[PDB]
Structure 1
Amino acid sequence: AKLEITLKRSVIGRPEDQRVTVRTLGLKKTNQTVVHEDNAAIRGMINKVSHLVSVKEQ
């Protein structure tokens, strides 16, 4: 299915490894709501971070 991905959190103050992964999700600023499909590829990014992001299912 689909799921929404937002930010509670800014990227400034976080390492370089977790910085570009935010860029690849389409997320640039804070509070930028972005929807994608429930796939294990994007789930692996969330499982890698899970703490800049408040996840949102449907």
Structure 2
Amino acid sequence: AELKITLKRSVIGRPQNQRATVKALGLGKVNSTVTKPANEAIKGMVNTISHLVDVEEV
């Protein structure tokens, strides 16, 4: 259905596709959140970013 996605780490020191994935979701600064639908594409973005992010099934 939906997922709350909060940014817990920084993007300094990471490669470019991970930066651009954080941008494609609409996450700006540390501890800013976002809510998205549950898809197979959004889950792929979350799986690319998992080490930087917390996710809660909402």
- Report the TM-score, using the length of structure 1 for normalisation: 0.90
Q: Which residue of 2 aligns with 1:5?
A: 5
Extract unaligned runs of 5+ from structure 2: none
Shift of 1:39: 0.7
2:25, 2:38 → 1: CA distance? 13
Residue 6 of structure 1 aligns to a residue whose secondary structure is: strand
Shift of 1:15: 1.0
Q: Which residue of 1 aligns with 2:17?
A: 17
Q: Does the 8 Å CA contact 2:3/2:37 hold for their aligned counterparts?
A: yes
Which structure is higher in helix share?
2
Extract unaligned runs of 5+ from structure 1: none
Q: What is the number of equivalent residue pairs in this alignment?
A: 58
Equivalent residue letter for 1:37: P
**Aligned residue runs from structure 1 range 1-58, under 5 A:** 1-58=1-58
- Report the TM-score, using the length of structure 2 for normalisation: 0.90
Shift of 1:17: 1.6
Sequence identity percentage = 62
Residue 10 of structure 1 aligns to a residue whose secondary structure is: coil
Residue 56 of structure 1 aligns to a residue whose secondary structure is: strand
Shift of 1:49: 2.1
